[PDB]
Structure formats: C-alpha cells, structure tokens
Write a protein that binds this ligand. Structure first.
Ligand SMILES: [N]C1=N[C]=NC2=C1N=[C]N2[C]1O[C]([C]OP([O])(=O)(OP([O])(=O)OP([O])([O])=O)/O=C(\[O])[C]([N+])[C]C2=[C][C]=C3[N]C4=C([C]=[C][C]=[C]4)C(=O)C3=[C]2)[C]([O])[C]1[O]
Ligand SMILES: Nc1ncnc2c1ncn2[C@@H]1O[C@H](COP(=O)(O)OP(=O)(O)OP(=O)(O)O)[C@@H](O)[C@H]1O
Ligand SMILES: [Mg+2]
Ligand SMILES: [Mg+2]
Ligand SMILES: [Mg+2]
Ligand SMILES: [Mg+2]
Ligand SMILES: [Mg+2]
Lengths: 259, 271
C-alpha cells in the first residue's frame, strides 16, 4: 500500500517530508506509519514556529530576493520597481489579446486596467527609455508580485531581468545571467530546455528568450530577458511539500503552518 | 514682489526638477517667466546628470534600500518579518469597520464581489499576530512591507510598512513610541513630531509628522477593534508610508518619483 490521497494531503498540511514515495505491506502498517509521521510533522512544525518567534529573521522570500538582487547588481544590473497596474493597451502590445489563453487569466481592475500577469511590459518600457540616455547596453531587473486567475498561486513573485542593446553571443550571455541567478538562489543544478526554459527535475522555474521583438517601432534594439518564479525556487530549495508555504500567506510563515 | 510661478509652471518645473519652486516670488510676469525659462533648463540638466550616474553605477532601488534598512533594524529588535497576500476579503474589511457607508470603503479596489486589493496591512497582520499568540506567552512583534491600494502626497499604489506589537512588556504607548523611533532613525529621518489626530477606524491616532506632513499613523487598540480580531490584551501598531519617507529624505518635489514607476527612477524622470 501507499499513503492514501487524503493521507498525503493531511501529512503535507503541517509536514514538509516526501510522503508520496512511501510503500507499505498492509493497511495496518500504512496506518501505523501515518500516525507516526503525522505526529512528527505536527511537533516539528510547532518547534519551528517557536524558533521564529524566539529568533526572528528576515522573511525567507525577502532573503531570496536580496540574495539574487545583490548578485545581479554586482553583474551591472540596475534594479527597478514598476507599478502593479498595467493598461489593456500594454497587454495588447504584449500580444495578450482577447483570444490568447493568458488574457482569460487577467484580473481586471476597471475597463482599461489590470493587475500585471508578468513584468515584461513594464521592464521593456523602462529599458527602452534608459537606452535613450546612453550609448551602451542597459541591464535591469525587477522583483515583484504578478497575478493570474488559477505550483500555481494567484499571486506570485516574479524576478524579471533584461539586457537591451549591442551584445555579442546573446545566447551565451543570457545563459550566464541564468547561471548568476540560479547560483545566487542556492540552486546550482538545473536543466536548460527548449527561447530557453529552466527546469529542476522536470519542473519549470524560468522562461527566457532572445529577441522578443515592440510593434510601435519598425527598428528594434537587440534584447534578451528571463523570468523566474521565486516561490517555486524557494519551495524547491527548502523542500517544502507545497508551493503555498514559503511566500505570502496568512496560514504559513517560512514553511510552517501558524494555525 | 507678490508674483509666484503659476500652478502650471510649478508642475512643469517639478516634472524634471527637485527644487523648491513654490517659494519663489517675483516683481512681475516678465521676471517670473524669465526665471521659469532658466530654471526649466537647470532642472532638465540636473535630471540628465542623475540618470547618467545611475547608468554608470548600477544600484539597488532607493525604495528597496529603504525597506532593507528599516527591516534590518526591526529584526535586530526581535520583530518577525511577514509577507501576506495583497488580496483580502470583504469580511476582513468589515472587521476593520470599513463598511459600505465609510469613506475608505469608497476607495477600495474590488477584484470580485468578495475580494479586494488591501488598502492597509492591518487586516492580515491582525490575523497573523493572533495566530502567533497561540505559540508564545511573550510579546508578539511582527511587521510587513508591501503594496497597498486606494482610489485617489497620494499614490494609488503605495508601500506601507506596518508593525504590530501584542502583549508588550511595559506601557503600550511608550513601547509604540520607541518602535516609531527605531523606524524613523533607521530611515534616516531622526527629526519628527508626534501629533494626536482623529481617526474613523482608530478613534484617535498618534501620527508622525515632518514639517506638518503625515508619514505614519499609529494607535493602541482601540479595544473594539482588537476584540473584533479576537485580541484581548494590550496591542498597538503603526503604518508608515515608505514613499512619503523617501520623498522627504531625498527632497524630491513630488511623491511619484521615489517608488514604483515607468516614468521615474530614483528621483529622475527617464522619459
Ligand atoms: N494614497 C497614499 N499614498 C501614499 N502613502 C499613503 C497613502 N495613503 C496612506 N499612505 C501612508 O500610509 C500611512 C498609514 O495610512 P493611513 O493612516 O490610513 O493614511 P491616511 O490617514 O488616510 O492618510 P492621509 O495622508 O490621506 O491623511 O493609516 C492606516 O491605514 C493605519 N492602518 C496605520 C495603522 C495604525 C495602527 C495600526 N495598528 C495595528 C496594525 C496591525 C496589527 C495590530 C495593530 C496596523 O497595521 C496599524 C496600522 C499614512 O500615514 C501615509 O504615510
Ligand atoms: N501562477 C503562478 N504561480 C507561481 N509561479 C508562476 C505562476 N505563473 C508563472 N509563474 C512563474 O513565472 C515564470 C514566468 O514564466 P511564464 O509567465 O511563461 O509562465 P507559464 O508558462 O504560465 O508557466 P506554467 O506552465 O508553469 O504555468 C514561470 O517560469 C513560473 O516560474
Ligand atoms: Mg501558466
Ligand atoms: Mg513559461
Ligand atoms: Mg487617506
Ligand atoms: Mg490622515
Ligand atoms: Mg493616517
């Protein structure tokens, strides 16, 4: 026997073990193991919360953001912050129009504005404007909340980075930026898949592309960028049993259930 | 003289300039207009220099840096940093006494019939604080920094720092004043006034004001609000506007330049 579906959900509520691989000889031994792992999960959870209260730390998601950010600034990236609201026109220039599947996932605020589902539209705008002020390449990044109707969260934290202007072996430059982020995140082992996808054990954690060409302009600047889901990265690194425990929450705090 | 820059001229000067244009007086319209022309060119020169410096010396964002400076100070004092969802429920708003007939209710961005963008951090922080009380007999001290939203020194999206301290050791007002001091000093704004102000939600607040400008509202309770969140002990909290703090410290001429933007970056207009 394995743990039942309901037992798996019960174990993952307070526990961060790997429960799905466990196998047993009969119901009696499944049930004995379940009772023991439930008790251990709950007591460990309680001790972890008592530890945060006793010795508070920066939030794990905030820490991950700072670790990546300082690595990117050291690589010459400017940090930007852009609004969570974006325009319908801005989405349509992203090709996210009434027919695209993502469009149905957009949270509208009024007839003309939405919560951003991605950072790219704002980031490309800022990169283009900064390039008006320099002869050299412009490298920027942003970390912030994005929203989609729905490892899926309705609110999730994206890291988006971009590099605009004269490059030189753009694909290798982008792969190096991915390396910088993944190593700074504490996840040095990953797979690149095909535009480039980053996977860990088959789970996508980043999508990146060279030359996402900006209908407003006949002639484009060379551009590269990459978008990472930070709750996914944190979940994988800390081995949390669901993606709902390491990010924003009123039930979980840094992996532990508070209620 | 008595002639000032026109309101339109002030807006034009502040678009790229961070000077103090509202102070200028002139003898006549000709002198006003000649000064305007000169100071518009200064403003755009200074703005371009700031942009070029940012490109030559990439850095963390000013708002992010302020957030880190204050957060590290609060963690050093034993505050837990929490992150909570931007979405909150209509019922959560009602427990704050933000119901259909209140003015703040009119400022809420609704996502659907039952959910809204949070206009304040208190609803989620009350929930987390109360749950953490189940795990300790001592003080419960938490803070969050994050975006709040209100239909509208006012932004529609702004970054609140909110802190809560439940079951403080000592007098709740004295403790609140001390943690306000920790924040303001860590923000680089050690000179400020505390002023009692009226509040629809809190009855009375203690506000932090710098030269008359509110940057924080804080309160002990009141009891009805605490009890609505199942809190039955001395409690206090405070909410700071981080863009307002940064604007005042960096002497930016509007509140739109130091936070999130696709036009401004750290005080400079990029378009
Ligand atoms: N729009 C805008 N923009 C910018 N900024 C801003 C805005 N709004 C606001 N802001 C800021 O924030 C702060 C705070 O807020 P308020 O106060 O509301 O505001 P007002 O008064 O309205 O203002 P004006 O200027 O218009 O006049 O407030 C609030 O929200 C409050 N909530 C704060 C607080 C207090 C207390 C408490 N307690 C507690 C908690 C939690 C838990 C426990 C306890 C909390 O959180 C809290 C909070 C202002 O100042 C500005 O800066
Ligand atoms: N709902 C979500 N919750 C958490 N992370 C997300 C969510 N949507 C996207 N991400 C993260 O943002 C990154 C940006 O990629 P992108 O917008 O192309 O995602 P996607 O193609 O919709 O992903 P998925 O196939 O995993 O749903 C994704 O690699 C993922 O890590
Ligand atoms: Mg998706
Ligand atoms: Mg993808
Ligand atoms: Mg107000
Ligand atoms: Mg006020
Ligand atoms: Mg106030």
């Amino acid at each position: 026997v394995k743990y039942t579906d309901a037992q798996i959900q019960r174990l993952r509520e307070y526990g961060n073990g790997t429960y799905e691989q466990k196998v047993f000889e009969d119901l009696a031994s499944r049930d004995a193991a379940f009772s023991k792992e439930m008790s251990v999960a709950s007591t460990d959870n309680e001790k972890k919360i008592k530890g945060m209260i006793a010795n508070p730390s920066r939030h794990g998601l905030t820490q991950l953001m700072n670790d990546i950010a300082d690595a990117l600034v050291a690589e010459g990236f400017i940090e930007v912050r852009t609004p969570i609201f974006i325009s319908k026109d801005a989405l349509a220039r992203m090709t996210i129009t009434e027919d695209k599947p993502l469009f149905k996932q957009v949270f509208w605020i009024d007839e003309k504005r939405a919560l951003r589902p991605m950072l790219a539209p704002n980031l490309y705008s800022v990169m283009r404007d900064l390039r008006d002020h320099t002869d050299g390449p412009v490298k920027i990044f942003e970390m912030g909340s994005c929203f989609r109707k729905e490892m899926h969260l309705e609110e999730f934290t994206m890291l988006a980075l971009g590099d605009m202007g004269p490059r030189g072996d753009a694909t290798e430059v982008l792969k190096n930026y991915i390396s910088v982020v993944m190593k700074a995140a504490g996840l040095p082992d990953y797979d690149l898949v095909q535009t480039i996808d980053v996977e860990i054990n088959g789970q996508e954690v980043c999508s990146a592309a060279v030359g996402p060409h900006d209908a407003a302009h006949d002639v484009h600047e060379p551009c590269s960028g990459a978008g990472f889901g930070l709750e996914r990265l944190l979940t994988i690194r800390e081995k949390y049993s669901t993606v709902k425990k390491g990010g924003a929450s009123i039930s979980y705090l840094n992996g532990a259930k508070i209620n």
